[PDB]
Amino acid sequence: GHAENPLREEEWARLNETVIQVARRSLVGRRILDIYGPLGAGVQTVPYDEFQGQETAMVFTDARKFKTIPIIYKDFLLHWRDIEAARTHNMPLDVSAAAGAAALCAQQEDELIFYGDARLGYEGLMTANGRLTVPLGDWTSPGGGFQAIVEATRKLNEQGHFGPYAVVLSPRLYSQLHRIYEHHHVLEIETIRQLASDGVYQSNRLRGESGVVVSTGRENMDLAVSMDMVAAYLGASRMNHPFRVLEALLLRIKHPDAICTLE
């Protein structure tokens, strides 16, 4: 009675679609970053940089750096009588716990993307060495956000990065960009959307009053994914069934000067 697969193919597919739909609904960075992969679950180490080209033998060693790929996961539990009822009474199965686990995993992925981990030697878009900086200014009065975005665009342009550009902002700035004033009547969010072709987005992971403008391109930054978010069975403990939702990816920043941060 221990078995290997407590569910059927249709239930497996339905759970996987639920998880992937939650992940695609929740993730933000995948709208601004390119994908290198999937490479496979057996790949654990990835290069970080780009390859640059007598009377005894010679020894050659690669000058590139390498990094290991981490894993993100979250667990949940299912009931054997519920599974039996679903199988015998021809009812659909409930996947709310799987949806919540996928949402938590997506939140953790976004946190790792935007801030990384200093203890493990991981860098984020907001803490990378070599990025450009633009003073925030005063967004309470009209014009500050547009001026800051224009200045950031100019500074990115002067370093040989010509766009198109993407903008990510904190909830406070995003809400401040939608204010209505007397005889101003034009949305700074609309003007910034017109200016930035790749898009303007809001993320709750950003803290306080902060924002980032990035120049897209595979030769500046990307995301290497070994295994996309998926669910697995951990084996029956007692008679209930445990499952785990997990994924594996890493962020590679090759040109730090394509990122500008607005205080």
Coordinates of C-alpha atoms in Angstrom, one line a residue, residues 96-251:
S96 CA -5.2 25.5 -2.6
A97 CA -2.1 24.5 -0.6
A98 CA -0.1 23.9 -3.8
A99 CA -1.2 27.4 -5.0
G100 CA 0.0 29.0 -1.7
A101 CA 3.3 27.1 -1.8
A102 CA 3.8 28.3 -5.4
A103 CA 3.1 31.9 -4.4
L104 CA 5.6 31.7 -1.5
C105 CA 8.2 30.2 -3.8
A106 CA 7.6 33.0 -6.4
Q107 CA 8.0 35.6 -3.6
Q108 CA 11.3 34.1 -2.5
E109 CA 12.5 34.0 -6.1
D110 CA 11.7 37.7 -6.6
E111 CA 13.5 38.5 -3.3
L112 CA 16.6 36.6 -4.4
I113 CA 16.5 38.3 -7.8
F114 CA 16.2 41.8 -6.4
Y115 CA 18.5 41.6 -3.4
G116 CA 20.6 38.4 -3.7
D117 CA 22.5 37.2 -0.7
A118 CA 25.8 38.8 0.6
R119 CA 26.7 35.8 2.8
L120 CA 26.6 33.4 -0.1
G121 CA 28.3 35.7 -2.6
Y122 CA 25.2 36.5 -4.6
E123 CA 24.5 40.0 -6.0
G124 CA 21.2 41.6 -6.9
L125 CA 20.2 44.4 -9.2
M126 CA 20.0 46.8 -6.3
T127 CA 23.4 45.9 -4.7
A128 CA 25.7 45.2 -7.6
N129 CA 29.1 46.9 -7.8
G130 CA 29.6 49.1 -10.8
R131 CA 26.0 50.3 -11.2
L132 CA 25.1 53.9 -11.9
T133 CA 23.2 56.2 -9.4
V134 CA 20.7 59.0 -10.0
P135 CA 19.5 61.2 -7.1
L136 CA 15.8 60.6 -6.4
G137 CA 14.8 64.2 -5.9
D138 CA 11.3 65.2 -4.8
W139 CA 8.4 63.2 -6.4
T140 CA 5.8 65.0 -4.3
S141 CA 5.7 67.8 -6.9
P142 CA 5.0 67.1 -10.6
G143 CA 8.0 66.6 -12.9
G144 CA 10.5 65.0 -10.5
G145 CA 9.9 61.4 -11.8
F146 CA 10.1 62.4 -15.4
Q147 CA 13.3 64.4 -14.8
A148 CA 14.9 61.5 -12.9
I149 CA 14.0 59.0 -15.6
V150 CA 15.4 61.3 -18.3
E151 CA 18.6 61.8 -16.3
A152 CA 19.0 58.1 -15.8
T153 CA 18.4 57.5 -19.5
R154 CA 21.1 60.1 -20.4
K155 CA 23.6 58.5 -18.0
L156 CA 22.9 55.1 -19.4
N157 CA 23.3 56.5 -22.9
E158 CA 26.7 58.1 -22.2
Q159 CA 28.1 54.7 -21.4
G160 CA 27.2 53.0 -24.7
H161 CA 23.9 51.5 -23.7
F162 CA 21.2 52.7 -26.0
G163 CA 18.1 50.9 -24.7
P164 CA 15.3 49.9 -24.8
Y165 CA 14.9 50.5 -21.1
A166 CA 12.8 49.0 -18.4
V167 CA 11.7 50.6 -15.1
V168 CA 10.8 49.0 -11.8
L169 CA 9.5 51.0 -8.9
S170 CA 8.4 50.6 -5.3
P171 CA 4.7 50.7 -4.3
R172 CA 5.1 54.2 -2.7
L173 CA 6.5 55.7 -5.9
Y174 CA 4.1 53.8 -8.1
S175 CA 1.1 55.3 -6.1
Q176 CA 2.7 58.7 -6.1
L177 CA 2.9 58.6 -9.9
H178 CA -0.9 58.3 -10.1
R179 CA -1.8 61.5 -8.2
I180 CA -4.2 64.1 -9.6
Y181 CA -3.3 67.8 -9.4
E182 CA -4.9 71.1 -10.4
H183 CA -4.5 71.8 -14.1
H184 CA -1.7 69.3 -14.6
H185 CA -4.0 66.5 -15.8
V186 CA -1.4 64.3 -17.5
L187 CA -0.1 61.1 -15.8
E188 CA 3.6 61.0 -15.1
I189 CA 3.1 57.2 -15.3
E190 CA 1.8 57.6 -18.8
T191 CA 4.7 59.8 -19.8
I192 CA 7.2 57.4 -18.3
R193 CA 5.4 54.5 -20.1
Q194 CA 5.8 56.4 -23.4
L195 CA 9.5 57.1 -22.7
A196 CA 10.4 53.5 -21.6
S197 CA 9.6 51.0 -24.4
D198 CA 10.1 47.8 -22.4
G199 CA 7.7 48.8 -19.6
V200 CA 7.2 50.2 -16.1
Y201 CA 6.4 47.7 -13.3
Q202 CA 5.7 47.7 -9.5
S203 CA 7.2 45.3 -7.1
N204 CA 6.5 44.9 -3.4
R205 CA 10.0 43.5 -2.8
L206 CA 11.5 47.0 -3.2
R207 CA 11.8 48.8 0.1
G208 CA 10.9 52.4 0.9
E209 CA 11.3 54.9 -2.0
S210 CA 13.6 53.2 -4.6
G211 CA 13.6 52.4 -8.3
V212 CA 15.8 50.8 -10.9
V213 CA 16.2 51.4 -14.7
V214 CA 17.8 48.7 -16.7
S215 CA 19.1 48.5 -20.3
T216 CA 17.9 45.1 -21.6
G217 CA 20.0 42.7 -23.6
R218 CA 21.4 39.2 -23.4
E219 CA 25.0 40.5 -23.3
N220 CA 24.3 42.6 -20.2
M221 CA 22.4 40.2 -17.9
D222 CA 20.3 37.1 -18.0
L223 CA 18.7 34.3 -15.9
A224 CA 20.0 30.7 -16.1
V225 CA 17.4 28.2 -15.1
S226 CA 18.2 24.6 -14.4
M227 CA 14.7 23.4 -13.5
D228 CA 11.5 25.4 -13.6
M229 CA 9.0 25.4 -10.8
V230 CA 7.5 21.9 -10.4
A231 CA 6.0 19.6 -7.8
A232 CA 7.2 16.2 -6.5
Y233 CA 6.0 13.5 -4.1
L234 CA 8.1 12.9 -1.0
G235 CA 6.7 9.5 -0.1
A236 CA 3.9 8.5 2.2
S237 CA 4.5 9.3 5.9
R238 CA 2.0 7.5 8.1
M239 CA -0.9 7.4 5.6
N240 CA -1.0 11.1 4.4
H241 CA 0.9 12.3 1.4
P242 CA 3.6 15.0 1.4
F243 CA 4.5 17.0 -1.7
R244 CA 7.2 19.6 -2.4
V245 CA 7.2 22.5 -4.9
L246 CA 10.7 23.5 -6.0
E247 CA 12.8 25.3 -8.7
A248 CA 16.4 26.2 -9.4
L249 CA 17.7 29.4 -11.1
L250 CA 20.5 32.0 -10.9
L251 CA 21.0 35.5 -12.1

